[PDB]
Amino acid sequence: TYKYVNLREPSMDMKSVTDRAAQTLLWTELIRGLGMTLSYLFREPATINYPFEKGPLSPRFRGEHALRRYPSGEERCIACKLCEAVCPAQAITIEAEPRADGSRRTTRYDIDMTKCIYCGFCQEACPVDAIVEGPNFEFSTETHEELLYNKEKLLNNGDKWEAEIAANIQADYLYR
Amino acid sequence: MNLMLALLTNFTLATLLVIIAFWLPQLNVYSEKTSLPFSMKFFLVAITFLLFDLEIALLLPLPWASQTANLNTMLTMALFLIILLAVSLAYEWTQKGLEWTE
Amino acid sequence: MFMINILMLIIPILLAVAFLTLVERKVLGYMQLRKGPNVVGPYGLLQPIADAIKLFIKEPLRPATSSASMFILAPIMALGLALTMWIPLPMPYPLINMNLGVLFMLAMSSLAVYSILWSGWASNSKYALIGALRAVAQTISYEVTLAIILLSVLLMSGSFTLSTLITTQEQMWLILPAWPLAMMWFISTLAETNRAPFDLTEGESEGFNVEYAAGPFALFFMAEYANIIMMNIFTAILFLGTSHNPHMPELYTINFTIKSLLLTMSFLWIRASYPRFRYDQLMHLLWKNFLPLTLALCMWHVSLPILTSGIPPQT
Amino acid sequence: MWFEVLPGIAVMGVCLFIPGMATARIHRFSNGGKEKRVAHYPYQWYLMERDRRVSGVNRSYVSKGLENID
Amino acid sequence: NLTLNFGPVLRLVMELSGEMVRKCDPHIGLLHRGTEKLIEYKTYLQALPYFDRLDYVSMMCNEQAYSLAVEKLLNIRPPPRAQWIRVLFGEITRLLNHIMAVTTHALDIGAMTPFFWMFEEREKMFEFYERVSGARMHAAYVRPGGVHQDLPLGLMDDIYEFSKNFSLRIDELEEMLTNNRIWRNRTVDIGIVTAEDALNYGFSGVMLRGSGIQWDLRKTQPYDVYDQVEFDVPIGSRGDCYDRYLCRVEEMRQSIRIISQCLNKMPPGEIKVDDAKVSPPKRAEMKTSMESLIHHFKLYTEGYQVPPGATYTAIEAPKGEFGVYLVSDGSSRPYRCKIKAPGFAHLAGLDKMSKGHMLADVVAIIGTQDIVFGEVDR
Amino acid sequence: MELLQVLKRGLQQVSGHGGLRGYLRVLFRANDVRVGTLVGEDKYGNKYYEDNKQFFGRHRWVIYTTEMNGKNTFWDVDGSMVPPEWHRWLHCMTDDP
Amino acid sequence: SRGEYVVAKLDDLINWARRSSLWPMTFGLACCAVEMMHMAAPRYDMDRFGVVFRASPRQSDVMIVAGTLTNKMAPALRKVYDQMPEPRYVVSMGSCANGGGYYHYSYSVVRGCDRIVPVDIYVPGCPPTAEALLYGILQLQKKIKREKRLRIWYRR
Ligand SMILES: CCCCCCCCCCCCCCCCCC(=O)OC[C@H](COP(=O)([O-])OCC[N+](C)(C)C)OC(=O)CCCCCCCCCCCCCCCCC
Ligand SMILES: CCCCCCCCCCCC(=O)OC[C@H](COP(=O)(O)OCC[N+](C)(C)C)OC(=O)CCCCCCCCCCC
Ligand code: SF4
Ligand code: SF4
Ligand code: SF4
Incomplete structure (x- = not known):
């Protein structure tokens, strides 16, 4: 099915021609536009008071990558390189070896x-659930080198944001 | 004497702001930077404005002209001038003179 | 005492211009569902000061100009004439009480077109000069309707004195008998001042001041914004005359100022509502719509006083 | 809210109010408490110059009534 | 004539004769990034985010085109709930694109206020994206086999509340443009395309419907569940910018009409094909079952193999017919992925559409073609 | 009348912030003088407020501490000064502070 | 008082003015320009900080490189930077301008705009949310506030 957007014939009866003459000479339709912006002047603006107010987000929000731990402090990452093999931008670099106690852990995770x-x-x-994207989205830096994270920066993020990462995972792990 | 003193202030103030606005910036001492085809339609609009302007000069004294006792003569001449000004607009209009398509 | 009078006129004009930029940015913001400047100072009142300081300490931009003397002449002419168009305005008493005040304002506004023309030459850019020619063509075109419309309203006032427009409107605003002229006069002031929907000089993807950045650019901006206020003050005196009580002059100024602010606000109101004309379309508006109607209404307003016995006094 | 636009408008109004208030008060200060004399035509100027001579002082805004008559 | 090099991401090299345009020669490639060559080095899942970034105003309609092509080669079928989510967010995306198209077009020719009214609506629709994917724009949510995750509880009620008021927002846009004489002067009789020229120049979308051609892939070659929804195709009569503007504004009204039916007819079930050799299993079963972990491991390192073949799959994206010619060699990486951006054929016809028009009309013509240079250059 | 009780809210904001000094401090630090319910204060001194009559987006806000980790943040406030536990509540990722 | 104190207050005044009137020239090259437009939209309203929506390059104080910088576009971007009057700052927005992002290994992509122009703030994301970009503009304002142009001149 379809409809015509602009296939109407204007009436030619004297009243309609005079209604169009009044619109041209008296600018009636240009004055509706003024009325529609005067309306918005008296509506409350949608602006929020950043940085004291923040834009709403959801538990799924993808922000700064971070490395997590088990409740015992042991790292969750067991150097499997599935994240490295799936990263579309080839942004993850991993190297690994047997840790001093025989565990399978990364020596590099950039x-x-x-x-x-x-x-x-x-x-x-x-x-x-070792590598996650936390809720942080305010980590702009002044140099390009501060955005090349190594394993220490990512582990620091996990310790720094675990309280919030854990609650975001608890709120959404049943959808995944 | 007031008008002469009024014009002197306005342009002197404007002159002072221009020069300081050119020199006040030149104290940051920034690093050294080290780095038409004639259109006949623009001419025609400029000429047409002139000829309409000269007609307006003749119409300007109308407020004083309506205080005379020969109103029958004055009103005829006043309407004659305005009408002839309309004829000029009608002529340019019908000769594609007011168009902008090449 | 006269030199003090001039400064009591010049300085508030520049402060009115300074805070019109703030009011324009908030009014547009609230019509756009925004807030506008509200951080720099309480309610943005310090935003104009921040912009002024920033502009006047930014690096000069002046590239190679073929007429360096003409580069300095354009801002001086633009800002000197913008302040000069205020001296005859009755508010209610003019600084310079001229017998031909109306003609004086037409004469001075017909010279401000040189600032546009000289800035185009002094930019050494063949595409800036083309922009100036378009800006000049628009301005002089709408000066034709300003003079003919103004001449038609003086045939009911009886003189070129600006103070006699107060007497003429002592019973009734001239807008009621001359609203057809007020409609065209008002739109002419938009086109004359190069304001939206007629600001084709700001067709970023579709100005002659580009060669001015900071400093002199700030002075061109002040001249343009000073003319918007002056034109809207001229409109109020001409079509919305205020009653003058000789023993309470300040009553006139309050009422007169309120009218002149509302008209200035409506310029912002219009800028937020419409798209802009093509260059040819705003020419066809003048030559093929306004000029035919203005000429017809000039004939009517010359004959109307004669046929009703309502010719005004010469003095 | 829209009323937060008013403080900017208030400053404009005061600035635009000063020129017309200052002129009115300066004219009365300089003309003995009266409006400045308007002389648009040469007859009005002739009377103003006649008042300047009649004034006794060289100022035309000082008026002499029925006290200079005998 | 006067030659102007309107440099920048568009470079127009025009030849002006007075104020008229005698020849328009678009110079493109200022956003050419080699997407098609990069896709050949990625697995099929890895190449999905590349499609969010082609027409980056209609992100989740680009994903659907790629997903329909890979599914056709895979010979699988996404589950019914996944198809209603893909048609629900296809129309939310069409609202996103048409707001960006009409309002940016209006802002170019001077009208700056409708941009701010509607970009608040875009901000609320960016929240629907962020609540299903976690990203506001580049969701990477529609995937071969269905969608990544299920809708969170409470989203559909929030989509309903947004959809009630959106017609009023369109009516305010129409109070500023539709009858405004200045807007009609900038668009009426500007850039007229004859129905036969439009077909031969490869036009699609409202570039055809604006000229009176009755064609819409959602109705002639339906995909997903578009055959189960009821809507109307707006058709122009003059082929000009104004009629194309009215088709776009009317398509937003029909999109709200479809969104109303997706919300009511949303079925239960899973959201990705129950075939763990194509779609990864749930994390709960990836951590208990040996088969699931094997299939999770291999779908995220090697990817799923696609049978050899070649498909040209197309959809009615908001800009027009968006398609991909996808060639599989049997491996887990595409052999060739040619991307058919509708704007590429439209922008090629800018020279024809600009004949006999002034310089300021070229701004209105580019706006009516709805050009985004992410897809033109790829 | 509604006109009068609009001015009541304007005045009660002066008292709701602890006087004229507190009213001015919030006006210049935060450019906002709304009064909301105090939801809690963190160990760094950030105070978190709430007003569910405001539209979504402005119904929660933080008034930042004037000193954090030995840095004077009276005028220099940063969005990253919100600790992770309150970050979740402030961005509406949850309803429970 | 001491000369440092007097010249330190003038530094604050000019620093205050320059960060309260940051006029950006946005190089909208790709999807990151949409989020830049959302920072001007009502919700964030960048114009309320003094950051005008879009200034001409010759009136601009900061350049926002928002999108992928290709080899074909690199010389054009440098020319606009060379024509910016000083003081001039550059904000790199998104992964493409930061380091090439998704197209880092392409034959036709500049691997970060910081090979063409100097960069003051890097904003990570693909795209950064409009709030993340705003957080980066407010960080540039804090960076202007820490300038000591007159102190260095005084102690020269
Ligand atoms: C007995 C009585 C005898 C005397 C009677 C004398 C008067 C009779 C009535 C005359 C008709 C009224 C003339 C009005 C002017 C018409 C001008 C015209 O040509 O319009 C058509 C023109 C052109 O119309 P068009 O573009 O549609 O095309 C007309 C011609 N055709 C169709 C052939 C192409 O339209 C405009 O002028 C619009 C200009 C843009 C306006 C944008 C800003 C709008 C702002 C609105 C607020 C204005 C408030 C003004 C008040 C100011 C207060 C101080
Ligand atoms: C006598 C020489 C002329 C200049 C006079 C000083 C003006 C510059 C200071 C304001 C900017 C500022 O300081 O910024 C805002 C300041 C707070 O800054 P802060 O974070 O504590 O600064 C930290 C240290 N920094 C800046 C080095 C990084 O707010 C205030 O409380 C200032 C409000 C009162 C200003 C009164 C101005 C009166 C002078 C008017 C005529 C010039
Ligand atoms: S972060 Fe996870 S996927 Fe990546 S190597 Fe460690 S365990 Fe494997
Ligand atoms: S897969 Fe790579 S690009 Fe994607 S979020 Fe993880 S680290 Fe970033
Ligand atoms: S960084 Fe991401 S959003 Fe920005 S231009 Fe590149 S792909 Fe697009």
Whole structure:
């Protein structure tokens, strides 16, 4: 089915021609536009008072990548490289070896945050919920080198944001 | 004497602001930077404005002209001038003179 | 005491211009569901001061100009004439009480077109000069209706004195008998001042001051914003005359000022509501719509006093 | 809210109010408490110059009534 | 004539004769990033985010086109709930694109106020994206096999509350543009395309319906569940910018009409194909079952193999016919992924549409073609 | 009348902030003088407020501490000064502070 | 008082003016320009901080590189930067301008706009949310507030 948007014939009876003459000479339709913006002057603006007010987000929000731990302090990451193999931007670099106690852990875990496309595929592919994207979105830096995270920066983010990452995962782990 | 003193202030003030606005910036000492085809339609609009302007000069004294005892003569001449000004507009209009399409 | 009088006129004009930028940015914001400047100072009152300081300490931009002397002449002419168009205005008593005050304002506004023309030459840019020619063509075109419309309203006042428009309107605003002229006069002031919907000089993807950035650009901005206020003050005196009580002059100024602010606000109101004309379309508005009607209403307003026995006094 | 636009409007109004208030008060200060004399035509100027001579002082805004007559 | 190099991401090299435009020569490639060559180095899941970033105003309609193409080669079918979510967010996305198209077009020719009214609506629709995917724009949410996750509880009620008021927002936009004589002067009889020229120049979308051609892939070649919704196709009569503007504004009203039916007819079930060799299993079963962990491991390292073949799958994206010619060699990475951006054929016809018009009309013509250079250059 | 009780709200904001000094401090630090319910204060001194009659987006806000980690933040406030536990409540990722 | 104190207050005044009238020239090259437009939209209303929506390059104080910078576009971006009157700052917005992002390994993409122009603030994201960009503009304002142009001149 379809409809015509602009296929109407204007009436030619004297009243309609005079109604159109009044519109042309007296600018009636240009004065409705003024009425529609005078309306908005007396509506409350939609602006929020950032940074004291923030824009609403959801538990799924994808922000700064971070590395997590078990409740015992042990790292969750067991150097499997599934996140590295799925990163579309090839932003993750991992190296690993047997830790001093025989465990399987990374010696390198870098994320080039200027290559990352903040897509969340890594946290989808991780079988142990080690690498996640936290809720932080305010980490702008003044130099390009501060955005090349290594394992210490990512572990620091996890310790720094675990209280909020854990509650976001608890709110959304049943949808995934 | 007031008008002469009024014009002197306005342009002297404007002159002072222009020069300081050119020099006040030149104290940051910034680093050294180290880095038409004639259109006949624009001419025609400029000429047409002139000829209409000269007609307006003849119409300007109308407020004083309506105080005379020969109103029958004055009103005829006043309407004659305005009408002839309309004829000029009608002529340019019908000769595609007011168009902008090449 | 006269030199003090001039400063009591010049300085408040520049402060009115300074805070018109703030009022324009908030009014547009609230019609756009925004807030406008509200951080720099309480309610943005310090925003104009921040912009002024920033502009006047920014790096000069002046590139190679072929007429450096003409580069300095344009802002001086633009700002000197903008302040000069205020001296005959009755508010209610004029600074310079001229017998031909109305003609004086037409004469001075017909010279401000040189600032546009000289700035185009002094920019050494063939595409800036084309922009100036378009801006000049628009301005002089709408000066034709301003003079003919103004001449038609003086045939009911009887003289070129600006103070006699107060007497003429002592019973009734001239807008009631001359609202057709007020409609065209008002839109002419928009086109004359190069304001939306007639600001094709700001067709970013579709100005002659580009060669001015900071400093002199700030002075061109003040001249333009000073003329918007002056034109809207002229409109109020001409079509919305205020009653004058000789023993309470300040009553006139309060009422007169309120009218002149509302008209200035309506310029912002209009800028927020409409798209802009093509260059040819705003020319066809003048030559093929306004000019035919203005000429017809000039004939009518010359003959109307004669046929009703309502010719005004010469003195 | 829209009334937050008013403080900017208030400053404009005061600034635009000063020129017309200042002129009215300066004219009365300079003309003995009266309006400045308007002389648009040469007859009005002739009377103003006649008042300047009649004034005794060289100022035309000082009026002499029925006390200079005998 | 006068040659103007209107540099920048568009570079127009025009040849002006007075105020008229005698020749318009768009120079593009200022946003060419080699997307098609990069996709050949990615698995099929890895190439999905590249499609959010082609027509970056209609992100989730680009994903659907890629997903329909890979699904066609895979020979699978997304589950019914996944198709209603894909048609629900296809129309939310069409509202996003048409707000950006009409209002940016209006802002270019002077009208700056409707941009701010409607970009608050875009801000609320960016929240629907962020509540299903976690990203405001580049969701990467529509995937071969269905969608990544299910709608969170409370979203559909929030979509309903937004949809009640949106017609009133369109009516305010029409109070500023539709009858405004200045707007009609900028658009009426500007950039007229004959129905035969439009077909031969490869036009699609409202570039055809504006000229009176009765064609819409959602109705002639339906995909997902568009055959189960009821809506009307707006048709122009003059082929000009004004009629194309009225088609777009009317399509927003029909999108709200479809959104009303998706919300009522949303069925239960799963949101990705119950085939763990194509769609990854749930994390709960990836951590208990040996098969699931194997299939999770291989779908996120190697990816799913796609049978050899070649498909040209197209949809009625908001800009027009968006399609992909996707060639599979049997491996887990695409062999070739040619992307058919509707704007590429439209912008190629700017020279024809600009003949006999002034310089300021070129701004209105580019706006009526709804050009985004993410898809033109790829 | 509604006109009068609009001015009541304007005055009660002066008292709701603890006087004229508090009213001015919030006006210049935060450019807002609304009064809301105090929901809690964190260990760094940030106070968090709430007003569910405001439209979504402006119904929760934080008045930042004037000193955090040995840095004077009276005029220099940053969005990253919100600790993670309150970050979740302030961005509406949850309803429970 | 001491000369440093007097010249430190003038530094504050000019620093205050420059960060209270940051007029940006936005190079809207790709999707990151949409989020830049959302920072001007009503919800964030960048114009309320003094940051006008869009200034001409010759009136601009900060350049926002928002999108992918391709080799074909690189010389054009440098020319606009060279024509910016000083003081001039550059904000790199998004992964493409930061380091090439998703197209880092492409034959036709500049691997970060900081190979063409100097960058003052890097805003991470793909795209950064309109709030993240705003947080980066407010960080540039804090960076202007810490300038010591007159102190260095005085102590020269
Ligand atoms: C006995 C009585 C005898 C005397 C009677 C004398 C008067 C009779 C009535 C005359 C008709 C009234 C003339 C009005 C002017 C008509 C001008 C015209 O040509 O219009 C058509 C023109 C052109 O109309 P058009 O573009 O549609 O095309 C007309 C011609 N055709 C169709 C062939 C192409 O329209 C405009 O002028 C619009 C200009 C843009 C306006 C944008 C700003 C709008 C702002 C609105 C607020 C204005 C408030 C003004 C009040 C100010 C207060 C101080
Ligand atoms: C005598 C030489 C002329 C200049 C006079 C000083 C003006 C500059 C200071 C304001 C900017 C400022 O200081 O910024 C805002 C300040 C707070 O700054 P802060 O965060 O504590 O500064 C931290 C240290 N920094 C800046 C080095 C990083 O707010 C205030 O309380 C200032 C409000 C009162 C201003 C009164 C101005 C009166 C002078 C008017 C004529 C010039
Ligand atoms: S979010 Fe995407 S781009 Fe960033 S590290 Fe994870 S997989 Fe790579
Ligand atoms: S973060 Fe997860 S997916 Fe990546 S190597 Fe560690 S355990 Fe494997
Ligand atoms: S960083 Fe992301 S959003 Fe920005 S231009 Fe690149 S792909 Fe688009």
